[PDB]
Design a protein around this ligand. Structure first.
Ligand SMILES: [Ca+2]
Ligand SMILES: [Ca+2]
Ligand SMILES: [Ca+2]
Lengths: 127, 87, 33
């Protein structure tokens, strides 16, 4: 079952990617690389599936703005998504869109992904 | 496995209502814990389900992994693995 | 919106533009960001 995940937000920016083999690439300059155990990949997939983000559509969401943009690409098996939006620094910004409920699922999934990546990179490289 | 700039374990299948003390009480016996990241699901207030645990040495992390994989936290079986591996 | 059930409060399910439904999610007792 194929897998891929990449998240981008931002030339100031933050970017991280998980390849199928567990390779984690991080960039924010600060560029880190490390291979995570299969248990980490398993947990990542569980979080993604639980978020139901794969069933969302970004059409109603705000397009890349001037303050910045966000990109979320995910592939799980035959399913895949490629979202592009403007920055979403808080819930007040989410609740100001046409589809606030859908955008909040995106906001929270992104928050969960960042928390996991920050913990992995931060503790591994003592950043 | 792959050591960090300490040695890090990745714990999964952690009960949603577990707090940091659940981790500390289970893992403190096998060595000095440098860091515990029991990440919260900010949308629900529950623990997301995983934790990173860093011991000072490899012997400690190995001992913890061998004894705690399969242990129970709040009645739920946890899995304990190395967090990083070599390419 | 939080809808309290007999076991606590939860985030109610919502309908997506495509007609499908997002699942309801329980929230920890006494929690609010
Ligand atoms: Ca406790
Ligand atoms: Ca306790
Ligand atoms: Ca048991």
């Amino acid at each position: 079952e194929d897998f891929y995940l990449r998240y981008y937000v931002g030339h100031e920016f933050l970017e991280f990617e998980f390849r199928p083999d567990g390779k984690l690439r991080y960039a924010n300059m600060i560029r880190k690389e490390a291979f995570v155990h299969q248990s980490v990949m398993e947990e990542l997939k569980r979080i993604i599936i639980d978020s139901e983000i794969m069933q969302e559509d970004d059409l109603p969401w705000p397009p890349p703005d001037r303050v910045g943009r966000q990109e979320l690409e995910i592939v799980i098996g035959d399913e895949h998504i490629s979202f592009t939006t403007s920055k979403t620094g808080s819930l007040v910004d989410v609740n100001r869109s046409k589809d606030p409920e859908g955008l909040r699922c995106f906001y929270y999934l992104v928050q969960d992904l960042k928390c996991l990546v920050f913990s992995l990179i931060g503790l591994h490289f003592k950043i | 496995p792959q050591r960090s700039v300490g040695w890090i374990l990745f714990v999964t299948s952690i009960h949603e209502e577990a707090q940091e003390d659940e981790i500390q009480e289970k893992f403190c016996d096998y060595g000095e814990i440098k860091n515990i990241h029991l990440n919260l699901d900010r949308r629900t207030g529950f623990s997301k389900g995983y934790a990173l645990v860093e011991y000072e040495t490899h012997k400690q992390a190995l001992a913890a992994k061998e004894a705690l994989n399969g242990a129970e936290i709040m009645g739920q079986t946890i899995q304990v693995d190395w967090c990083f591996v070599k390419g | 919106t939080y809808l309290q059930s007999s076991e606590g409060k939860f985030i109610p399910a919502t309908k997506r533009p495509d007609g499908t439904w997002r699942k309801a999610r329980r929230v920890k007792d006494g929690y609010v960001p």
